[PDB]
Symmetry: C3
Subunit: 207 residues, 3 copies
Protein backbone atom coordinates (compact mmCIF):
# COMPACT_ATOMS: atom_id res chain seq x y z
CA UNK A 1 0.00 0.00 0.00
CA UNK A 2 2.23 2.75 -1.23
CA UNK A 3 0.30 5.97 -2.02
CA UNK A 4 1.02 9.33 -3.58
CA UNK A 5 1.23 12.42 -1.28
CA UNK A 6 -1.97 14.45 -0.64
CA UNK A 7 -5.10 13.16 -2.14
CA UNK A 8 -8.53 12.27 -0.83
CA UNK A 9 -9.30 9.04 1.01
CA UNK A 10 -12.69 7.46 0.18
CA UNK A 11 -14.71 5.37 2.65
CA UNK A 12 -16.75 3.02 0.48
CA UNK A 13 -16.10 1.35 -2.84
CA UNK A 14 -19.47 0.81 -4.43
CA UNK A 15 -21.49 2.46 -7.14
CA UNK A 16 -21.89 5.73 -5.21
CA UNK A 17 -18.11 5.81 -4.75
CA UNK A 18 -17.64 5.60 -8.51
CA UNK A 19 -19.73 8.74 -9.03
CA UNK A 20 -17.99 10.57 -6.20
CA UNK A 21 -14.55 9.64 -7.55
CA UNK A 22 -15.48 11.10 -10.93
CA UNK A 23 -16.81 14.30 -9.35
CA UNK A 24 -13.56 14.77 -7.45
CA UNK A 25 -11.41 14.07 -10.52
CA UNK A 26 -13.56 16.47 -12.62
CA UNK A 27 -12.48 19.15 -10.15
CA UNK A 28 -8.79 18.24 -10.48
CA UNK A 29 -8.60 16.47 -7.16
CA UNK A 30 -6.62 13.24 -6.73
CA UNK A 31 -8.20 10.25 -5.01
CA UNK A 32 -5.60 8.49 -2.90
CA UNK A 33 -7.19 5.24 -1.74
CA UNK A 34 -10.42 3.45 -0.77
CA UNK A 35 -11.23 1.71 2.48
CA UNK A 36 -13.99 -0.85 2.08
CA UNK A 37 -15.57 -3.42 4.41
CA UNK A 38 -14.74 -6.01 1.79
CA UNK A 39 -10.93 -5.42 2.11
CA UNK A 40 -9.70 -1.12 -7.21
CA UNK A 41 -12.60 1.20 -8.02
CA UNK A 42 -12.14 3.21 -11.26
CA UNK A 43 -8.42 2.88 -10.77
CA UNK A 44 -8.34 3.81 -7.06
CA UNK A 45 -6.74 1.07 -4.94
CA UNK A 46 -8.67 -0.53 -2.09
CA UNK A 47 -6.09 -0.63 0.67
CA UNK A 48 -8.08 -2.34 3.48
CA UNK A 49 -11.13 -1.89 5.66
CA UNK A 50 -11.75 0.90 8.20
CA UNK A 51 -8.97 -0.49 10.40
CA UNK A 52 -6.61 1.02 7.76
CA UNK A 53 -7.69 4.60 8.62
CA UNK A 54 -5.02 5.20 11.31
CA UNK A 55 -2.26 4.04 8.90
CA UNK A 56 -3.54 6.38 6.20
CA UNK A 57 -3.58 9.33 8.60
CA UNK A 58 -0.09 8.43 9.89
CA UNK A 59 1.32 8.69 6.36
CA UNK A 60 0.06 12.16 5.94
CA UNK A 61 -3.37 11.76 4.32
CA UNK A 62 -5.84 14.04 6.01
CA UNK A 63 -8.70 14.66 3.55
CA UNK A 64 -11.60 12.18 3.29
CA UNK A 65 -15.00 11.62 1.74
CA UNK A 66 -17.60 9.09 2.90
CA UNK A 67 -19.08 7.52 -0.26
CA UNK A 68 -21.68 5.33 1.42
CA UNK A 69 -25.34 5.58 0.30
CA UNK A 70 -26.89 4.35 3.54
CA UNK A 71 -27.56 7.48 5.53
CA UNK A 72 -27.21 6.20 9.07
CA UNK A 73 -23.98 4.32 8.19
CA UNK A 74 -22.56 7.31 6.33
CA UNK A 75 -23.18 9.49 9.35
CA UNK A 76 -21.46 7.02 11.68
CA UNK A 77 -18.46 6.68 9.37
CA UNK A 78 -18.13 10.43 9.04
CA UNK A 79 -17.85 10.67 12.82
CA UNK A 80 -15.26 7.89 12.84
CA UNK A 81 -13.24 9.62 10.11
CA UNK A 82 -13.20 12.90 12.02
CA UNK A 83 -12.16 11.13 15.19
CA UNK A 84 -9.22 9.66 13.28
CA UNK A 85 -8.12 13.18 12.27
CA UNK A 86 -9.49 13.47 8.78
CA UNK A 87 -11.21 16.56 7.40
CA UNK A 88 -14.37 15.81 5.41
CA UNK A 89 -14.19 17.40 1.95
CA UNK A 90 -17.12 18.17 -0.30
CA UNK A 91 -17.53 16.42 -3.67
CA UNK A 92 -19.27 19.03 -5.85
CA UNK A 93 -19.37 18.23 -9.57
CA UNK A 94 -18.22 21.15 -11.76
CA UNK A 95 -21.59 21.26 -13.54
CA UNK A 96 -23.57 21.71 -10.32
CA UNK A 97 -24.99 25.22 -9.74
CA UNK A 98 -24.70 26.14 -6.07
CA UNK A 99 -25.96 29.67 -5.31
CA UNK A 100 -23.51 31.96 -3.55
CA UNK A 101 -25.83 32.31 -0.54
CA UNK A 102 -26.04 28.55 0.04
CA UNK A 103 -24.50 27.31 3.30
CA UNK A 104 -22.72 24.00 2.87
CA UNK A 105 -21.59 21.61 5.57
CA UNK A 106 -18.73 19.13 5.17
CA UNK A 107 -18.73 15.70 3.54
CA UNK A 108 -21.51 16.81 1.17
CA UNK A 109 -21.99 15.24 -2.27
CA UNK A 110 -23.48 17.49 -4.92
CA UNK A 111 -23.69 15.55 -8.21
CA UNK A 112 -23.72 16.60 -11.86
CA UNK A 113 -26.63 18.66 -13.06
CA UNK A 114 -27.81 19.79 -9.61
CA UNK A 115 -29.12 23.27 -8.90
CA UNK A 116 -29.33 24.67 -5.35
CA UNK A 117 -30.92 28.13 -4.98
CA UNK A 118 -30.62 31.09 -2.65
CA UNK A 119 -30.35 30.83 1.14
CA UNK A 120 -30.55 27.07 1.30
CA UNK A 121 -28.66 25.29 4.09
CA UNK A 122 -27.14 21.90 3.45
CA UNK A 123 -26.09 19.82 6.45
CA UNK A 124 -22.97 17.73 6.83
CA UNK A 125 -22.90 14.46 4.91
CA UNK A 126 -25.97 15.26 2.79
CA UNK A 127 -26.23 13.79 -0.73
CA UNK A 128 -27.80 15.97 -3.44
CA UNK A 129 -27.85 13.40 -6.24
CA UNK A 130 -27.69 13.70 -10.00
CA UNK A 131 -29.97 16.31 -11.51
CA UNK A 132 -31.73 17.13 -8.24
CA UNK A 133 -33.17 20.60 -7.66
CA UNK A 134 -33.25 22.42 -4.32
CA UNK A 135 -35.23 25.71 -4.50
CA UNK A 136 -34.68 28.78 -2.32
CA UNK A 137 -34.76 28.76 1.49
CA UNK A 138 -34.56 24.98 1.91
CA UNK A 139 -33.05 23.27 4.96
CA UNK A 140 -31.41 19.86 4.48
CA UNK A 141 -30.52 17.99 7.63
CA UNK A 142 -27.29 16.13 8.24
CA UNK A 143 -26.92 12.91 6.29
CA UNK A 144 -30.14 13.25 4.29
CA UNK A 145 -30.25 12.06 0.66
CA UNK A 146 -32.10 13.70 -2.22
CA UNK A 147 -32.12 11.04 -4.90
CA UNK A 148 -31.48 11.57 -8.63
CA UNK A 149 -33.90 13.94 -10.37
CA UNK A 150 -35.72 14.76 -7.09
CA UNK A 151 -36.94 18.33 -6.52
CA UNK A 152 -37.75 20.52 -3.52
CA UNK A 153 -39.77 23.68 -4.05
CA UNK A 154 -39.14 26.68 -1.87
CA UNK A 155 -38.91 26.59 1.90
CA UNK A 156 -38.78 22.83 2.32
CA UNK A 157 -37.15 21.27 5.38
CA UNK A 158 -35.73 17.71 5.23
CA UNK A 159 -34.79 16.00 8.48
CA UNK A 160 -31.60 14.20 9.33
CA UNK A 161 -31.11 10.94 7.42
CA UNK A 162 -34.31 11.34 5.38
CA UNK A 163 -34.26 9.77 1.91
CA UNK A 164 -36.13 10.93 -1.17
CA UNK A 165 -36.16 8.37 -4.00
CA UNK A 166 -35.56 9.02 -7.69
CA UNK A 167 -37.85 11.75 -8.95
CA UNK A 168 -39.56 12.55 -5.64
CA UNK A 169 -41.05 16.05 -5.31
CA UNK A 170 -41.94 18.26 -2.38
CA UNK A 171 -44.21 21.34 -2.61
CA UNK A 172 -43.35 24.65 -0.94
CA UNK A 173 -43.09 24.98 2.80
CA UNK A 174 -43.34 21.28 3.65
CA UNK A 175 -41.32 19.72 6.49
CA UNK A 176 -40.22 16.08 6.32
CA UNK A 177 -39.07 14.43 9.52
CA UNK A 178 -35.86 12.68 10.32
CA UNK A 179 -35.41 9.08 9.08
CA UNK A 180 -38.36 9.30 6.67
CA UNK A 181 -38.38 7.70 3.25
CA UNK A 182 -40.27 9.13 0.29
CA UNK A 183 -40.55 6.53 -2.45
CA UNK A 184 -39.48 7.12 -6.02
CA UNK A 185 -41.85 9.54 -7.72
CA UNK A 186 -43.65 10.45 -4.48
CA UNK A 187 -45.20 13.93 -4.44
CA UNK A 188 -45.25 15.26 -0.88
CA UNK A 189 -48.06 17.75 -0.29
CA UNK A 190 -48.22 17.83 3.54
CA UNK A 191 -45.72 17.60 6.35
CA UNK A 192 -44.38 14.12 7.14
CA UNK A 193 -43.41 13.05 10.67
CA UNK A 194 -40.23 11.20 11.59
CA UNK A 195 -39.65 7.58 10.72
CA UNK A 196 -42.36 6.98 8.12
CA UNK A 197 -42.52 5.73 4.52
CA UNK A 198 -44.64 7.74 2.08
CA UNK A 199 -45.43 6.76 -1.54
CA UNK A 200 -47.64 7.90 -4.38
CA UNK A 201 -49.01 10.99 -6.08
CA UNK A 202 -49.91 12.47 -3.65
CA UNK A 203 -47.64 10.72 -1.19
CA UNK A 204 -49.39 8.74 1.50
CA UNK A 205 -47.91 7.07 4.57
CA UNK A 206 -47.71 3.31 4.30
CA UNK A 207 -47.86 1.47 7.64
Amino acid sequence: ASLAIGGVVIIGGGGHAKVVIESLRACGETVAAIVDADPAVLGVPVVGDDLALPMLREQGLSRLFVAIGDNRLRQKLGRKARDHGFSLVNAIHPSAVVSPSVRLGEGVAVMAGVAINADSWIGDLAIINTGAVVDHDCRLGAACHLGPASALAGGVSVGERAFLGVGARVIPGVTIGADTIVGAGGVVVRDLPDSVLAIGVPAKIKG
Copy 2:
Protein backbone atom coordinates in the same frame (compact mmCIF):
# COMPACT_ATOMS: atom_id res chain seq x y z
CA ALA B 1 -32.39 56.29 -0.87
CA SER B 2 -29.20 57.03 -2.69
CA LEU B 3 -28.46 54.51 -5.48
CA ALA B 4 -25.63 53.73 -7.86
CA ILE B 5 -26.05 54.68 -11.58
CA GLY B 6 -27.54 52.05 -13.97
CA GLY B 7 -28.65 48.86 -12.47
CA VAL B 8 -31.87 46.88 -12.49
CA VAL B 9 -34.88 47.74 -10.35
CA ILE B 10 -36.75 44.73 -8.88
CA ILE B 11 -40.49 44.73 -8.14
CA GLY B 12 -40.91 42.23 -5.31
CA GLY B 13 -38.72 41.24 -2.40
CA GLY B 14 -39.63 37.68 -1.57
CA GLY B 15 -38.11 34.28 -2.17
CA HIS B 16 -38.53 34.49 -5.96
CA ALA B 17 -36.74 37.84 -5.88
CA LYS B 18 -33.77 36.23 -4.15
CA VAL B 19 -33.37 33.73 -6.99
CA VAL B 20 -33.80 36.42 -9.64
CA ILE B 21 -31.24 38.68 -7.94
CA GLU B 22 -28.70 35.85 -8.00
CA SER B 23 -29.40 35.10 -11.68
CA LEU B 24 -28.82 38.75 -12.58
CA ARG B 25 -25.61 38.97 -10.52
CA ALA B 26 -24.35 35.69 -12.06
CA CYS B 27 -24.56 37.49 -15.40
CA GLY B 28 -22.62 40.50 -14.10
CA GLU B 29 -25.63 42.74 -13.80
CA THR B 30 -26.07 45.11 -10.85
CA VAL B 31 -29.36 45.20 -8.95
CA ALA B 32 -30.14 48.76 -7.95
CA ALA B 33 -33.11 48.58 -5.59
CA ILE B 34 -36.31 46.72 -4.64
CA VAL B 35 -39.82 48.08 -4.42
CA ASP B 36 -42.03 45.99 -2.17
CA ALA B 37 -45.60 46.34 -0.90
CA ASP B 38 -44.18 46.02 2.58
CA PRO B 39 -42.07 49.25 2.25
CA ALA B 40 -32.87 44.54 2.17
CA VAL B 41 -33.00 41.34 0.12
CA LEU B 42 -29.59 39.66 -0.38
CA GLY B 43 -28.01 43.05 0.06
CA VAL B 44 -30.35 44.98 -2.26
CA PRO B 45 -32.07 47.88 -0.48
CA VAL B 46 -35.86 48.07 -0.32
CA VAL B 47 -36.50 51.71 -1.10
CA GLY B 48 -40.33 51.86 -0.84
CA ASP B 49 -43.48 50.44 -2.40
CA ASP B 50 -44.64 50.87 -6.01
CA LEU B 51 -45.25 54.58 -5.38
CA ALA B 52 -41.42 54.86 -5.49
CA LEU B 53 -41.30 53.88 -9.19
CA PRO B 54 -41.58 57.44 -10.58
CA MET B 55 -38.70 58.60 -8.31
CA LEU B 56 -36.53 55.71 -9.48
CA ARG B 57 -37.21 56.53 -13.14
CA GLU B 58 -36.56 60.25 -12.52
CA GLN B 59 -33.07 59.46 -11.22
CA GLY B 60 -32.14 57.65 -14.33
CA LEU B 61 -33.01 54.00 -13.63
CA SER B 62 -34.76 52.52 -16.60
CA ARG B 63 -34.30 48.73 -16.44
CA LEU B 64 -36.66 46.58 -14.33
CA PHE B 65 -37.61 43.02 -13.51
CA VAL B 66 -40.87 41.89 -11.89
CA ALA B 67 -39.95 39.21 -9.33
CA ILE B 68 -43.47 38.30 -8.24
CA GLY B 69 -44.59 34.64 -8.34
CA ASP B 70 -48.31 35.30 -8.65
CA ASN B 71 -48.97 35.33 -12.36
CA ARG B 72 -51.88 37.74 -12.58
CA LEU B 73 -50.14 40.23 -10.22
CA ARG B 74 -46.84 39.92 -12.08
CA GLN B 75 -48.60 40.71 -15.33
CA LYS B 76 -50.31 43.77 -13.85
CA LEU B 77 -47.06 45.06 -12.36
CA GLY B 78 -45.20 44.57 -15.62
CA ARG B 79 -47.75 46.80 -17.32
CA LYS B 80 -47.39 49.39 -14.57
CA ALA B 81 -43.59 49.31 -14.87
CA ARG B 82 -43.74 49.87 -18.62
CA ASP B 83 -46.18 52.72 -18.18
CA HIS B 84 -43.68 54.34 -15.81
CA GLY B 85 -40.99 54.16 -18.52
CA PHE B 86 -39.06 51.09 -17.51
CA SER B 87 -37.83 48.44 -19.93
CA LEU B 88 -38.39 44.87 -18.73
CA VAL B 89 -35.13 42.90 -18.78
CA ASN B 90 -34.80 39.14 -18.85
CA ALA B 91 -33.20 37.25 -15.94
CA ILE B 92 -31.56 34.23 -17.60
CA HIS B 93 -29.17 32.25 -15.40
CA PRO B 94 -25.80 31.57 -17.09
CA SER B 95 -26.32 27.80 -16.78
CA ALA B 96 -29.63 27.83 -18.66
CA VAL B 97 -29.52 26.42 -22.21
CA VAL B 98 -31.73 28.51 -24.49
CA SER B 99 -31.66 27.33 -28.13
CA PRO B 100 -30.73 29.94 -30.71
CA SER B 101 -34.11 29.60 -32.43
CA VAL B 102 -36.08 30.32 -29.26
CA ARG B 103 -38.11 33.56 -29.29
CA LEU B 104 -38.05 35.31 -25.94
CA GLY B 105 -40.33 38.08 -24.73
CA GLU B 106 -39.39 40.62 -22.05
CA GLY B 107 -39.47 40.27 -18.28
CA VAL B 108 -38.85 36.52 -18.59
CA ALA B 109 -37.16 34.51 -15.83
CA VAL B 110 -35.17 31.49 -16.95
CA MET B 111 -33.59 29.84 -13.88
CA ALA B 112 -30.51 27.67 -13.38
CA GLY B 113 -30.46 24.31 -15.05
CA VAL B 114 -33.24 25.02 -17.56
CA ALA B 115 -33.18 23.77 -21.14
CA ILE B 116 -35.39 25.30 -23.86
CA ASN B 117 -35.24 23.65 -27.30
CA ALA B 118 -35.67 24.69 -30.90
CA ASP B 119 -38.44 27.00 -32.16
CA SER B 120 -40.08 27.51 -28.80
CA TRP B 121 -41.77 30.86 -28.13
CA ILE B 122 -41.74 32.30 -24.65
CA GLY B 123 -44.16 35.12 -23.85
CA ASP B 124 -43.50 38.23 -21.82
CA LEU B 125 -43.28 37.76 -18.06
CA ALA B 126 -43.11 33.95 -18.22
CA ILE B 127 -41.21 32.06 -15.50
CA ILE B 128 -39.24 28.96 -16.54
CA ASN B 129 -38.17 27.80 -13.08
CA THR B 130 -35.19 25.85 -11.84
CA GLY B 131 -34.36 22.74 -13.82
CA ALA B 132 -37.44 22.93 -16.03
CA VAL B 133 -37.36 21.51 -19.56
CA VAL B 134 -39.18 22.97 -22.56
CA ASP B 135 -38.90 20.72 -25.67
CA HIS B 136 -39.05 21.87 -29.29
CA ASP B 137 -41.93 23.87 -30.80
CA CYS B 138 -43.55 24.86 -27.51
CA ARG B 139 -45.61 28.02 -27.03
CA LEU B 140 -45.65 29.65 -23.58
CA GLY B 141 -48.19 32.38 -23.06
CA ALA B 142 -47.55 35.67 -21.31
CA ALA B 143 -47.12 35.43 -17.56
CA CYS B 144 -47.30 31.63 -17.36
CA HIS B 145 -45.12 29.76 -14.83
CA LEU B 146 -43.40 26.42 -15.34
CA GLY B 147 -42.44 25.36 -11.84
CA PRO B 148 -39.12 23.79 -10.78
CA ALA B 149 -38.28 20.48 -12.46
CA SER B 150 -41.40 20.63 -14.68
CA ALA B 151 -41.16 19.37 -18.28
CA LEU B 152 -43.00 19.98 -21.55
CA ALA B 153 -42.53 17.53 -24.40
CA GLY B 154 -42.66 18.77 -27.95
CA GLY B 155 -45.36 21.01 -29.36
CA VAL B 156 -47.02 21.92 -26.08
CA SER B 157 -48.96 25.17 -25.74
CA VAL B 158 -49.41 26.82 -22.31
CA GLY B 159 -51.95 29.62 -21.96
CA GLU B 160 -51.48 33.00 -20.37
CA ARG B 161 -51.03 32.89 -16.59
CA ALA B 162 -51.15 29.07 -16.42
CA PHE B 163 -49.15 27.48 -13.60
CA LEU B 164 -47.47 24.09 -13.59
CA GLY B 165 -46.36 22.93 -10.13
CA VAL B 166 -43.05 21.33 -9.20
CA GLY B 167 -42.36 18.33 -11.38
CA ALA B 168 -45.45 18.58 -13.59
CA ARG B 169 -45.20 16.99 -17.05
CA VAL B 170 -47.03 17.49 -20.31
CA ILE B 171 -46.96 15.01 -23.23
CA PRO B 172 -46.45 16.10 -26.85
CA GLY B 173 -48.96 18.29 -28.62
CA VAL B 174 -51.12 19.12 -25.60
CA THR B 175 -52.69 22.57 -25.14
CA ILE B 176 -53.33 23.95 -21.65
CA GLY B 177 -55.69 26.89 -21.33
CA ALA B 178 -55.15 30.25 -19.76
CA ASP B 179 -55.35 30.52 -15.94
CA THR B 180 -55.13 26.74 -15.44
CA ILE B 181 -53.21 25.13 -12.61
CA VAL B 182 -51.53 21.73 -12.90
CA GLY B 183 -50.65 20.44 -9.46
CA ALA B 184 -47.18 19.30 -8.48
CA GLY B 185 -46.33 16.03 -10.22
CA GLY B 186 -49.38 16.16 -12.51
CA VAL B 187 -48.95 14.35 -15.83
CA VAL B 188 -51.11 16.03 -18.47
CA VAL B 189 -52.17 13.64 -21.23
CA ARG B 190 -55.06 15.56 -22.85
CA ASP B 191 -55.84 19.19 -23.54
CA LEU B 192 -57.00 21.27 -20.56
CA PRO B 193 -59.48 24.15 -20.91
CA ASP B 194 -59.09 27.56 -19.31
CA SER B 195 -59.49 28.14 -15.61
CA VAL B 196 -59.30 24.59 -14.26
CA LEU B 197 -57.20 22.70 -11.70
CA ALA B 198 -55.81 19.32 -12.75
CA ILE B 199 -53.94 16.85 -10.48
CA GLY B 200 -52.64 13.31 -10.57
CA VAL B 201 -50.97 10.77 -12.84
CA PRO B 202 -52.71 11.11 -15.24
CA ALA B 203 -53.93 14.60 -14.42
CA LYS B 204 -57.64 14.91 -13.85
CA ILE B 205 -59.73 18.06 -13.42
CA LYS B 206 -60.84 18.67 -9.87
CA GLY B 207 -64.09 20.64 -9.53
Copy 3:
Protein backbone atom coordinates in the same frame (compact mmCIF):
# COMPACT_ATOMS: atom_id res chain seq x y z
CA ALA C 1 -28.44 20.26 -54.76
CA SER C 2 -25.04 21.79 -54.43
CA LEU C 3 -23.52 21.28 -50.95
CA ALA C 4 -20.48 22.46 -49.03
CA ILE C 5 -17.60 19.95 -48.44
CA GLY C 6 -17.65 17.84 -45.23
CA GLY C 7 -20.59 18.23 -43.01
CA VAL C 8 -23.11 15.87 -41.48
CA VAL C 9 -26.04 14.40 -43.40
CA ILE C 10 -29.31 14.12 -41.41
CA ILE C 11 -31.94 11.43 -42.03
CA GLY C 12 -35.21 13.01 -40.92
CA GLY C 13 -36.53 16.55 -40.98
CA GLY C 14 -38.99 16.80 -38.15
CA GLY C 15 -38.99 18.26 -34.67
CA HIS C 16 -36.33 15.84 -33.38
CA ALA C 17 -34.13 16.83 -36.32
CA LYS C 18 -34.37 20.47 -35.28
CA VAL C 19 -32.99 19.66 -31.82
CA VAL C 20 -30.26 17.45 -33.26
CA ILE C 21 -29.23 20.14 -35.76
CA GLU C 22 -28.85 22.64 -32.94
CA SER C 23 -26.80 20.19 -30.85
CA LEU C 24 -24.43 19.61 -33.76
CA ARG C 25 -24.09 23.34 -34.50
CA ALA C 26 -23.49 24.07 -30.78
CA CYS C 27 -20.45 21.81 -31.11
CA GLY C 28 -19.19 23.64 -34.20
CA GLU C 29 -20.25 20.96 -36.63
CA THR C 30 -21.77 21.82 -40.01
CA VAL C 31 -24.97 20.12 -41.14
CA ALA C 32 -24.80 19.46 -44.86
CA ALA C 33 -28.26 18.31 -45.91
CA ILE C 34 -31.45 16.48 -44.88
CA VAL C 35 -33.05 13.48 -46.52
CA ASP C 36 -36.74 13.20 -45.70
CA ALA C 37 -39.52 10.88 -46.86
CA ASP C 38 -41.43 13.98 -47.82
CA PRO C 39 -38.80 15.04 -50.45
CA ALA C 40 -35.40 23.34 -45.30
CA VAL C 41 -35.17 22.62 -41.58
CA LEU C 42 -33.54 25.43 -39.54
CA GLY C 43 -31.70 26.45 -42.67
CA VAL C 44 -30.56 22.95 -43.71
CA PRO C 45 -31.74 22.04 -47.22
CA VAL C 46 -33.88 18.97 -47.79
CA VAL C 47 -32.28 17.44 -50.86
CA GLY C 48 -34.55 14.40 -51.44
CA ASP C 49 -35.68 11.18 -49.80
CA ASP C 50 -33.49 8.20 -48.86
CA LEU C 51 -32.90 7.45 -52.55
CA ALA C 52 -30.58 10.52 -52.42
CA LEU C 53 -28.15 8.77 -50.03
CA PRO C 54 -25.93 7.23 -52.75
CA MET C 55 -25.56 10.65 -54.46
CA LEU C 56 -24.58 12.27 -51.17
CA ARG C 57 -21.95 9.60 -50.51
CA GLU C 58 -20.64 9.89 -54.09
CA GLN C 59 -19.96 13.60 -53.58
CA GLY C 60 -17.83 12.96 -50.60
CA LEU C 61 -20.21 13.20 -47.63
CA SER C 62 -19.54 10.37 -45.25
CA ARG C 63 -20.84 11.43 -41.81
CA LEU C 64 -24.53 10.97 -40.90
CA PHE C 65 -27.02 11.18 -38.07
CA VAL C 66 -30.45 9.53 -37.98
CA ALA C 67 -32.85 12.10 -36.47
CA ILE C 68 -35.96 9.92 -36.40
CA GLY C 69 -37.89 9.52 -33.11
CA ASP C 70 -39.48 6.17 -33.92
CA ASN C 71 -37.09 3.61 -32.53
CA ARG C 72 -37.63 0.71 -34.90
CA LEU C 73 -37.47 3.04 -37.95
CA ARG C 74 -34.37 4.81 -36.64
CA GLN C 75 -32.65 1.47 -36.21
CA LYS C 76 -33.53 0.38 -39.75
CA LEU C 77 -32.34 3.68 -41.23
CA GLY C 78 -29.08 3.52 -39.32
CA ARG C 79 -28.40 0.14 -40.90
CA LYS C 80 -29.25 1.53 -44.33
CA ALA C 81 -26.94 4.52 -43.80
CA ARG C 82 -24.04 2.28 -42.83
CA ASP C 83 -24.65 0.06 -45.81
CA HIS C 84 -24.40 3.14 -48.02
CA GLY C 85 -20.96 3.93 -46.53
CA PHE C 86 -21.80 6.55 -43.96
CA SER C 87 -20.33 6.68 -40.47
CA LEU C 88 -22.88 7.42 -37.74
CA VAL C 89 -21.78 10.39 -35.63
CA ASN C 90 -22.97 11.22 -32.15
CA ALA C 91 -24.94 14.41 -31.44
CA ILE C 92 -23.95 15.34 -27.87
CA HIS C 93 -24.99 18.81 -26.74
CA PRO C 94 -22.13 20.79 -25.14
CA SER C 95 -24.08 21.12 -21.87
CA ALA C 96 -24.52 17.36 -21.44
CA VAL C 97 -22.36 15.75 -18.73
CA VAL C 98 -21.11 12.36 -19.92
CA SER C 99 -18.82 10.64 -17.38
CA PRO C 100 -15.41 9.61 -18.65
CA SER C 101 -16.15 5.93 -17.95
CA VAL C 102 -19.31 5.91 -20.06
CA ARG C 103 -19.19 3.71 -23.18
CA LEU C 104 -20.98 5.29 -26.11
CA GLY C 105 -22.09 3.63 -29.32
CA GLU C 106 -22.58 5.46 -32.62
CA GLY C 107 -25.56 7.49 -33.82
CA VAL C 108 -26.40 8.42 -30.22
CA ALA C 109 -28.27 11.62 -29.34
CA VAL C 110 -27.47 13.13 -25.96
CA MET C 111 -29.49 16.35 -25.54
CA ALA C 112 -28.97 19.51 -23.49
CA GLY C 113 -28.98 19.18 -19.74
CA VAL C 114 -28.40 15.41 -19.64
CA ALA C 115 -26.19 13.72 -17.07
CA ILE C 116 -24.83 10.18 -17.57
CA ASN C 117 -22.82 8.71 -14.68
CA ALA C 118 -20.00 6.23 -14.22
CA ASP C 119 -19.73 2.91 -16.08
CA SER C 120 -22.94 3.28 -18.03
CA TRP C 121 -23.10 1.73 -21.50
CA ILE C 122 -25.12 3.41 -24.21
CA GLY C 123 -25.99 1.41 -27.32
CA ASP C 124 -25.95 2.56 -30.90
CA LEU C 125 -28.79 4.85 -31.95
CA ALA C 126 -30.02 5.50 -28.40
CA ILE C 127 -31.69 8.84 -27.60
CA ILE C 128 -31.00 10.39 -24.18
CA ASN C 129 -33.40 13.32 -24.41
CA THR C 130 -33.40 16.76 -22.86
CA GLY C 131 -32.65 16.87 -19.16
CA ALA C 132 -32.65 13.09 -18.72
CA VAL C 133 -30.54 11.47 -16.01
CA VAL C 134 -28.78 8.12 -16.30
CA ASP C 135 -27.17 7.02 -12.98
CA HIS C 136 -24.14 4.76 -12.60
CA ASP C 137 -23.86 1.25 -14.08
CA CYS C 138 -26.83 1.53 -16.44
CA ARG C 139 -27.13 -0.41 -19.70
CA LEU C 140 -29.09 1.17 -22.56
CA GLY C 141 -29.85 -1.07 -25.50
CA ALA C 142 -29.55 -0.11 -29.13
CA ALA C 143 -32.17 2.31 -30.37
CA CYS C 144 -33.86 2.87 -27.01
CA HIS C 145 -35.23 6.33 -26.12
CA LEU C 146 -35.16 8.00 -22.71
CA GLY C 147 -37.61 10.85 -23.06
CA PRO C 148 -37.14 14.41 -21.75
CA ALA C 149 -36.69 14.71 -17.99
CA SER C 150 -36.73 10.90 -17.51
CA ALA C 151 -34.40 9.36 -14.91
CA LEU C 152 -32.78 5.97 -14.32
CA ALA C 153 -31.34 5.20 -10.91
CA GLY C 154 -28.32 2.98 -10.62
CA GLY C 155 -27.92 -0.36 -12.34
CA VAL C 156 -30.92 -0.10 -14.64
CA SER C 157 -31.03 -2.03 -17.91
CA VAL C 158 -33.20 -0.80 -20.83
CA GLY C 159 -33.80 -3.15 -23.75
CA GLU C 160 -33.44 -2.43 -27.42
CA ARG C 161 -36.03 0.00 -28.79
CA ALA C 162 -37.66 0.59 -25.39
CA PHE C 163 -39.24 4.02 -24.88
CA LEU C 164 -39.59 5.94 -21.65
CA GLY C 165 -41.98 8.92 -21.87
CA VAL C 166 -41.43 12.40 -20.49
CA GLY C 167 -40.57 12.26 -16.81
CA ALA C 168 -40.56 8.47 -16.44
CA ARG C 169 -38.47 7.05 -13.58
CA VAL C 170 -36.88 3.70 -12.90
CA ILE C 171 -35.61 2.57 -9.46
CA PRO C 172 -32.25 0.86 -8.97
CA GLY C 173 -31.50 -2.51 -10.48
CA VAL C 174 -34.62 -2.80 -12.64
CA THR C 175 -34.53 -4.38 -16.11
CA ILE C 176 -36.94 -3.24 -18.82
CA GLY C 177 -37.38 -5.48 -21.85
CA ALA C 178 -36.97 -4.71 -25.49
CA ASP C 179 -39.81 -2.84 -27.27
CA THR C 180 -41.49 -1.80 -24.01
CA ILE C 181 -43.12 1.56 -23.50
CA VAL C 182 -43.26 3.33 -20.13
CA GLY C 183 -45.80 6.12 -20.25
CA ALA C 184 -45.04 9.69 -19.29
CA GLY C 185 -44.51 9.97 -15.54
CA GLY C 186 -44.46 6.19 -15.01
CA VAL C 187 -42.45 5.03 -12.00
CA VAL C 188 -41.06 1.55 -12.66
CA VAL C 189 -40.51 -0.44 -9.48
CA ARG C 190 -40.19 -4.00 -10.85
CA ASP C 191 -38.74 -5.59 -13.95
CA LEU C 192 -40.80 -5.27 -17.13
CA PRO C 193 -40.83 -7.95 -19.85
CA ASP C 194 -40.51 -7.30 -23.56
CA SER C 195 -43.26 -5.72 -25.60
CA VAL C 196 -45.49 -4.27 -22.89
CA LEU C 197 -46.93 -0.85 -22.00
CA ALA C 198 -46.67 0.25 -18.37
CA ILE C 199 -48.24 3.41 -16.87
CA GLY C 200 -48.78 4.99 -13.48
CA VAL C 201 -47.14 5.54 -10.11
CA PRO C 202 -46.20 2.75 -9.62
CA ALA C 203 -46.17 1.64 -13.23
CA LYS C 204 -48.54 -1.17 -14.08
CA ILE C 205 -48.83 -3.16 -17.31
CA LYS C 206 -51.84 -2.25 -19.38
CA GLY C 207 -53.15 -5.05 -21.60
